[PDB]
DNA sequence: CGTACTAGTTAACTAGTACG
DNA sequence: CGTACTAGTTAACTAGTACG
């Protein structure tokens, strides 16, 4: 008897990661910006921008139900959708998220 | 004219920044992937994916224009209209893209 | 008070062929 | 031999209302 993969690694990274590598050489300086206008779109962080603000603003949950669609213009079914999403996750690495709101 | 600084305007962008700080906060750990599974979607990582497979095999030029359609499946207008891309960035920060081919 | 949902229109990306 | 084009389809995202 004897196992085939266990000791080290479990979970095998192929693409999302190689891709994080080459960003953290660009992430020390700043050049994943003109790196990003020639491998994806300016429709990237055109939706980075109203999809993180649904989320930045739904986590503090004041004014962000009816009242908020006007200030931007982001229908009902992405601000109430984007809240489905928190359900799914861990509770470990949701966890890092109060550590990136909170301020610690 | 002027000996330094020349035409004053002043300009910035405040989307793909708010989403930056907070992904350098998940990159000294590795908790930016929940963080791409709640504010980014499966098809993010299948657009980073395919988009730097079309890229990193154009620029050493072996099998990516012709025979690599089968290999994968992206078709010939994405793989031959990412090199379209190419010619409109800058060579002061395409300079940093062999800082990152060269050595990766 | 809050959420979920039913109806409403847009957007990128995919695939095999045409010519320089 | 290397690029870009004609024709083909596959997902994503908006908006305003009603019920628990
Ligand atoms: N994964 C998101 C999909 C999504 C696309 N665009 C959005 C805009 C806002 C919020 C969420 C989204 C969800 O279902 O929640
Ligand atoms: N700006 C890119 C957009 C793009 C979308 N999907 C792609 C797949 C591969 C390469 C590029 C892309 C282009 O037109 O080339």
Request: aromatic share 4%; charged share 25%.
């Amino acid at each position: 008897q004897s196992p085939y993969s266990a000791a080290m690694a479990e979970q095998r990274h192929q693409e999302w990661l190689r891709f994080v590598d080459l960003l953290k050489n660009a992430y020390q300086n700043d050049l994943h910006l003109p790196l990003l206008n020639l491998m994806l779109t300016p429709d990237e962080r055109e939706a980075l921008g109203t999809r993180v603000r649904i989320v930045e603003e739904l986590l503090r949950g004041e004014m962000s139900q009816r009242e908020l669609k006007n200030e931007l213009g982001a229908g009902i079914a992405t601000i109430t959708r984007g809240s489905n999403s928190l359900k799914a996750a861990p509770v470990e690495l949701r966890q890092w998220l109060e550590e990136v709101l909170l301020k610690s």
